[PDB]
Structures are given as structure tokens and as C-alpha cells.
Amino acid sequence: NLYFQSMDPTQFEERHLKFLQQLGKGNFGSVEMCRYDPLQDNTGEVVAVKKLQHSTEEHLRDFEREIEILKSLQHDNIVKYKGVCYSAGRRNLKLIMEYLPYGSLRDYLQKHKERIDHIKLLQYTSQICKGMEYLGTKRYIHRDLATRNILVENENRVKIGDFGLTKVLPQDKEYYKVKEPGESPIFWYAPESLTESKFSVASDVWSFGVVLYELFTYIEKSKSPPAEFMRMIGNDKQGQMIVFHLIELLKNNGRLPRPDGCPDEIYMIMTECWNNNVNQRPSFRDLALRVDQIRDNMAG
Ligand SMILES: C1=C/COCc2cc(ccc2OCCN2CCCC2)Nc2nccc(n2)-c2cccc(c2)COC/1
């Protein structure tokens, strides 16, 4: 009550945060490119700024928790927290991050196939696994691992980018049971997430298997996880019927296909991630090591 939580409201002052570009709007809210130019000389660092789309009390509270999560993370493969801007005369909240120029990995794979080969895909895979190892040391569950939430700094570096659904494990449990679900990315969910709302490191590993599938489909039209699962369940189905059939499909070993051109050994990693037995899924540490050994065993 007495001494309010530490925060630096002078680090990013709204009057010096200059708009450069709207980058995207979505479930995550809205993200812009800005320049922070305190010496009003048309210079300063370029930053990414996350804002809410609908500024309800619940969303602001969720946003505060998301900011605290990101601030607590420092890793080469996690987007870098810089600070907060308390704009509207310190009656609003905006998240300030480093700016990563190539956007989401989902878009990058579609827009920049000219500079992507299997070596790069394996490098991105490795980096995502290492980011996720680090999250696990904090007992954070990402819950939304998907190429749309991974950001691209350059041809050699990706970072896990959005933490809007991330949960902190209870002290005594290895899973978080989400008891207020919003919009759910069901085609990335593990079966126990679909059927019991249970999220864990192992359910992030399931989602990572889907990420790995995404990478090797090169975000080809008709090959996205939603498109493939809908083709398998029946494109005609609507509403809850989709979820019912997805669960039944996954519970009896229905899986996304091997992407065209995907090596069998990479598909084997996917299918090991997609184990209905939670305890039998590999760890992110297992996965980083295996992928880097595959990379390292190539000639050169
Ligand atoms: C990305 C979603 C769409 O790409 C936006 C996008 C994003 C970036 C660069 C280009 C770009 O779209 C360049 C192409 N845009 C498409 C429409 C106009 C520009 N860079 C960036 N850098 C740091 C943090 C975030 N985004 C960030 C942090 C939290 C949440 C998000 C981003 C939103 O989810 C991840």
C-alpha cells in the first residue's frame, strides 16, 4: 500500500516516443514501430511498442502481468524488454521492446523464401528450443508457441516474441489449469490442454512440434495446421463439432502429415513431440541437443 511498486515512468516519456509505423493488430493487441528521441534531434533508438486494442480493466491487469513476465526474461532468443511508457499523463500503459525488423517468422517464411533453406530452418528450430529451455527455468508456460508469435531479427536470429497467454506454474504443480479460457489456438494444443485445460512444459513441447511442422511446410497455402486439420476432420464442420472431432482424431493418433521435402528424421522429432503420453515427450533440452547434433553432423 504505502510504497508503490518500483517502476521507471521517466525512462520512456510519451512526448519523446515518436510514431514511425503501424506493424500489426490482432489478438495480441496492436504493435507499432516508434523512435525514442529524448534529445529532440530526429535520432534515438527504434523500438517496438505494444498497446491494447480494448482497454478494459481485465485486459490492463493481464497486460501488467505480461509485462512483468517479459521483464523477468533475458535471453538471446527472447525479444528484449526495454521498459514501459505511462502515456496519457500516466493513465495508460504501453510496453516498450527492442525492434526486430523482419517481423513474424510466419510472415518471413512466406515473404522471404529466397533466403531460407533447411539449414536455416534447423537454426531457427534450435534457437526456439533454447528460448523455451530458458522459459522452463522460470517455470513459465508459453501456451501459444506458433510461428506467428516468433519474431525474426535477421537471417541468422529469431526470438520468441509474444507472451500474452503465458502462465506461471504454481509452486507445487507441474501444470497450470486455465480456468477462464479466452480464444484458444486449438490447432496447436496438446490433447490434455483440449480436454482438461492443463498446460505444462510438455504441452509447450507438443506446440513446438507444430511449430517445427510449420517451418518445413514453408507456410505453403493449404498446408497450415488449421487447413490440414480441417481437411482431415471435414471442411464442412463448424463450431464445437470441430473441437469434438479434433480431440477424437488426436486421441487415436491422427497427426499432421510429413511436409513435402521434410527429412524423415525431422518428421520423427515432430511425432515424438506429439505423444499423447505427456511424460514421454522429449524435453526442450533433449530437442536442442538433437537438432544441433543433426546440424553439426552435416559435412562442414
Ligand atoms: C507479429 C505480428 C505481425 O507482424 C508485426 C511486425 C513486427 C515487427 C516487425 C514487422 C512487423 O510487421 C511487418 C509487416 N507488417 C504486416 C502489416 C504491416 C507491417 N517487429 C517486432 N519487433 C519487436 C517486437 C514485436 N515486433 C512484437 C511484440 C509483441 C507482439 C507482436 C510483435 C505481434 O505478434 C508478432
Author numbering: 833 to 1132
Structure paper excerpt:
JAK2 activity is crucial for hematopoietic signaling particularly in homomeric myeloid, and hormone receptors and activating mutations of JAK2 have been identified in multiple malignancies, most notably Philadelphia chromosome-negative myeloproliferative neoplasms (MPNs), where mutated JAK2 drives the disease manifestations. MPNs are clonal neoplastic diseases initiated in the bone marrow from a mutated hematopoietic stem cell. All of these compounds are type-I inhibitors that target the conserved active conformation of the adenosine 5′-triphosphate (ATP)-binding pocket of the kinase domain and show variable target selectivity and differences in clinical profiles. Structural analysis showed that all compounds anchor to the ATP-pocket of the kinase domain of JAK2 by making two or three hydrogen bonds with the hinge region.
Pacritinib and fedratinib possessed the highest JAK2 selectivity in the binding assay. Pacritinib makes two hydrogen bonds to the hinge, to the main chain carbonyl and amide of Leu932, and a hydrogen bond with Leu855 from the β1-strand. Pacritinib stabilizes a collapsed G-loop structure in JAK2, where Phe860 is buried within the binding site. Pacritinib and gandotinib represent the first JAK2 structures with a collapsed G-loop conformation. Interestingly, the binding of pacritinib and gandotinib, which both form a collapsed G-loop, is driven both by enthalpy and entropy. The favorable entropy is partly due to the desolvation of Phe860 at the tip of the G-loop, which buries itself to the ATP-pocket upon inhibitor binding. Gandotinib, pacritinib, and lestaurtinib, which make a water-mediated hydrogen bond to Asp939, could directly interact with the glutamate in this position in JAK1.
